[PDB]
Amino acid sequence: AVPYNRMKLMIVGACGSGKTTLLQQLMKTKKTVGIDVKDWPIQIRDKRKRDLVLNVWDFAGREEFYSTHPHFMTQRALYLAVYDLSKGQAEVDAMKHYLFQIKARASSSPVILVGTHLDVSDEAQRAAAMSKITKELLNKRGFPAIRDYHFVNATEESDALAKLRKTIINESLNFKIR
Amino acid sequence: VPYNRMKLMIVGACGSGKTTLLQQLMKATVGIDVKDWPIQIRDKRKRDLVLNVWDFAGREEFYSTHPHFMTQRALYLAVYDLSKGEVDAMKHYLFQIKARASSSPVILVGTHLDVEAQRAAAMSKITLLPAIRDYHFVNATEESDALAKLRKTIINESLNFKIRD
Numbered sequence: 001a002v003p004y005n006r007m008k009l010m011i012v013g014a015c016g017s018g019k020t021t022l023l024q025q026l027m028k029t030k031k032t033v034g035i036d037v038k039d040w041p042i043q044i045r046d047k048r049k050r051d052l053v054l055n056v057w058d059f060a061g062r063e064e065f066y067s068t069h070p071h072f073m074t075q076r077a078l079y080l081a082v083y084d085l086s087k088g089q090a091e092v093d094a095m096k097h098y099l100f101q102i103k104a105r106a107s108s109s110p111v112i113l114v115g116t117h118l119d120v121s122d123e124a125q126r127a128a129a130m131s132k133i134t135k136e137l138l139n140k141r142g143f144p145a146i147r148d149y150h151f152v153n154a155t156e157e158s159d160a161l162a163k164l165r166k167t168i169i170n171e172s173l174n175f176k177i178r
Numbered sequence: 179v180p181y182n183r184m185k186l187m188i189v190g191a192c193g194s195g196k197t198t199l200l201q202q203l204m205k206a207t208v209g210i211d212v213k214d215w216p217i218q219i220r221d222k223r224k225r226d227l228v229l230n231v232w233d234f235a236g237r238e239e240f241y242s243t244h245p246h247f248m249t250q251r252a253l254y255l256a257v258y259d260l261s262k263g264e265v266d267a268m269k270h271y272l273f274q275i276k277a278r279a280s281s282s283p284v285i286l287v288g289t290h291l292d293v294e295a296q297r298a299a300a301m302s303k304i305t306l307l308p309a310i311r312d313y314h315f316v317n318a319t320e321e322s323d324a325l326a327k328l329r330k331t332i333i334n335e336s337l338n339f340k341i342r343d
């Protein structure tokens with residue numbers, strides 16, 4: 001059983017979406033874990049046999065963490081689906097791949113959409129993104145339960161960011177209730 | 179072109195020679211930053227919340243080649259230091275793996291062969307015999323016949339697990 005005070009947050013999205021930047025800005029308070037995943041083409045170029053490619057997981061960090069986080073590799077988590085608003089509606093459409101992945105591999109997990117790069121976006125992009133979110137993503141079959149969607153500047157502190165923090169707390173607790 | 183996929187989990191006590199063995203076995207890497215975020219703590223009125231946060235890196239190609247790299251169904255490499263006599267500690271990992279993935283296969287690997295008649299005693303305890311599909315004793319620091327044999331064992335067990343019968 002997951003410890004009463006713990007659960008997982010998965011930050012997913014295309015490269016350049018501002019995922020690492022958003023996480024840096026969201027976390028003002030911290031507190032070992034290490035995971036190296038490597039691609040290993042262990043059987044290739046064999047004339048008769050199909051190729052075999054392994055994804056290999058190598059773990060680092062302190063033993064205490066792994067004792068305190070018994071289910072830390074579960075797929076059941078809160079997901080932040082992050083995209084660059086300044087890249088236009090095509091980026092929201094690209095996000096659908098991530099959303100499908102979440103719906104298939106973790107059908108019960110909730111999602112919060114986060115559009116970064118709000119400071120370098122124009123209102124037409126904001127309105128188009130919101131329109132597409134509400135007309136194509138919210139409560140549509142084949143997509144996970146999108147509980148909220150935000151538009152932020154991931155590079156600095158602001159009220160929108162504190163709002164996202166509170167949404168994250170609230171949705172995590174909603175998920176803990178199951 | 180069709181090709182076969184599988185996940186390999188390398189477990190064992192710290193210092194067992196896991197990273198060295200994997201480096202030697204392998205003759206678009208992915209990096210995962212996992213951090214604890216105490217987003218709600220120390221307020222006596224409010225339930226605490228500490229989030230385990232995963233941030234992903236690497237080339238997108240990996241994710242096309244391993245779409246399900248987060249699955250729990252995997253082959254396990256249980257690595258231990260033979261020179262420590264560590265042999266009893268490994269059992270806990272097996273229990274974890276046996277409980278968390280009763281269907282996953284296991285390959286035990288004793289490193290530190292160069293530094294072992296005592297190592298032979300380990301075999302006694304193994305015969306501890308999750309589905310323990312093979313048992314090996316190698317030196318993870320250099321190429322050798324036992325190492326290539328373990329390579330082939332890994333191939334064969336990966337396919338046995340993925341392919342039904």
Ligand SMILES: *CCC(=O)N1CCN(c2nc(OC[C@@H]3CCCN3C)nc3c(F)c(-c4nc(N)cc(C)c4C(F)(F)F)c(Cl)cc23)[C@@H](C)C1
Nearest residue numbers: 012015098101102105234235236238241242245246247248
């Ligand atoms: C700059 C590199 C970087 O930030 N990342 C982020 C994570 N990531 C990624 N990429 C893809 O797709 C890349 C392209 C787009 C079309 C398909 N592919 C060729 N997919 C990802 C995922 F599907 C996941 C993922 N994987 C599993 N097994 C389950 C779940 C629920 C997910 C999901 F994201 F949805 F949460 C992940 Cl973790 C990451 C993916 C790369 C771009 C590298």
Ligand SMILES: *CCC(=O)N1CCN(c2nc(OC[C@@H]3CCCN3C)nc3c(F)c(-c4nc(N)cc(C)c4C(F)(F)F)c(Cl)cc23)[C@@H](C)C1
Nearest residue numbers: 059060061063066070071072189190192193270271274275
């Ligand atoms: C040098 C540091 C290093 O390489 N590592 C990797 C191993 N590791 C670690 N340590 C512990 O504590 C010891 C005991 C023995 C049984 C497991 N544990 C309670 N535990 C680890 C784990 F439990 C895991 C693990 N965690 C989860 N959630 C699931 C599963 C299936 C496992 C595992 F694969 F091991 F079975 C892991 Cl991945 C690593 C553990 C550190 C010392 C860091």
Ligand SMILES: Nc1nc2c(ncn2[C@@H]2O[C@H](COP(=O)(O)OP(=O)(O)O)[C@@H](O)[C@H]2O)c(=O)[nH]1
Nearest residue numbers: 015016017018019020021116117118153154155
């Ligand atoms: N102006 C601006 N730049 C941002 C914002 N979010 C991220 N970036 C930048 O965009 C690039 C991608 O950020 P990064 O966190 O690496 O995205 P990731 O690949 O999804 O992890 C970096 O140069 C970031 O500094 C934002 O809200 N505004």
Ligand SMILES: Nc1nc2c(ncn2[C@@H]2O[C@H](COP(=O)(O)OP(=O)(O)O)[C@@H](O)[C@H]2O)c(=O)[nH]1
Nearest residue numbers: 192193194195196197198289290291316317318
């Ligand atoms: N002599 C010898 N040294 C080994 C062997 N396997 C690993 N080592 C060394 O023992 C240490 C193990 O470190 P590492 O690979 O990080 O162990 P891990 O924490 O279990 O991954 C390193 O200094 C390795 O070079 C082995 O078979 N023989």
Ligand SMILES: [Br-]
Nearest residue numbers: 027028029217
């Ligand atoms: Br905080």
Ligand SMILES: [Br-]
Nearest residue numbers: 071072073074
């Ligand atoms: Br787990």
Ligand SMILES: [Br-]
Nearest residue numbers: 105246248249
């Ligand atoms: Br998966």
Ligand SMILES: [F-]
Nearest residue numbers: 183184245246
């Ligand atoms: F698969």
Ligand SMILES: [Mg+2]
Nearest residue numbers: 019020234235
């Ligand atoms: Mg990043």
Ligand SMILES: [Mg+2]
Nearest residue numbers: 059060196197
């Ligand atoms: Mg290591």
